[PDB]
Amino acid sequence: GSHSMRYFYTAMSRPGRGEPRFIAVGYVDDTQFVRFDSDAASPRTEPRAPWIEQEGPEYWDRNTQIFKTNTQTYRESLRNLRGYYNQSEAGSHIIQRMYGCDLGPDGRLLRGHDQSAYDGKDYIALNEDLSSWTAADTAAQITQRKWEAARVAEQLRAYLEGLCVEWLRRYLENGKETLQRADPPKTHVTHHPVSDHEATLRCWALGFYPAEITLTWQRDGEDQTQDTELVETRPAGDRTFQKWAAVVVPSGEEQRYTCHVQHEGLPKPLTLRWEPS
């Protein structure tokens, strides 16, 4: 929607090395704001954005209690799954869970999410109706029965529709300055000769937020979608992103190429060209 909140859980068993590890990170759109790792010196919830630091001790203690408990719940879960699949207690396994809520235009719940994966593959997920499940295989159905008998769906719906949205709105307020302002990218085109016959024109989009962006190389207005090489959007390390689109062109004809840039933090799409210095 206009804004989203997600929590990413990773529980991994490690036979011989120690008891299972549990990591949880929280995101409001493309910004991480909290982290918990049951392996850190002191297993506790830590802030990852400046705006979440303005919350009192109660908040932190609350998160830490939930996570410490979760760490135990997941250890039991791993053991349960291992049993379902007839797996040796000698192999490492991973359970990943993701959930969150999407805020609509009216400030209310747009969509709720809850998906689980075992060893990289879909295990069970909450359906869009927020009242039914979709189990991947017969083992996931064992879990489905437990969760149905324990009415987990009702509990989750309550959370996604209430607590999730309520808190998302608080975070969006506390961090209004950075979470609700779209940072446009600083752009520029570079020229790199590969041989005396051809050269690479690389179009850069740096320091933008959110990550969503579209870079396109055009020759005489014609989109060169087929010849363009794009790198995956990557983090700059300061809560902004980077990305570049390259195209190989013949020496001299470079004057016929223009870079098209699309990002929500821009009034309209940008159109650049390489300028010889």
Partner: peptide
């Protein structure tokens, strides 16, 4: 704020 995960798989 996350939900209390009380029911195992």
């Amino acid at each position: 704020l996350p939900p209390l995960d009380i029911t195992p798989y």
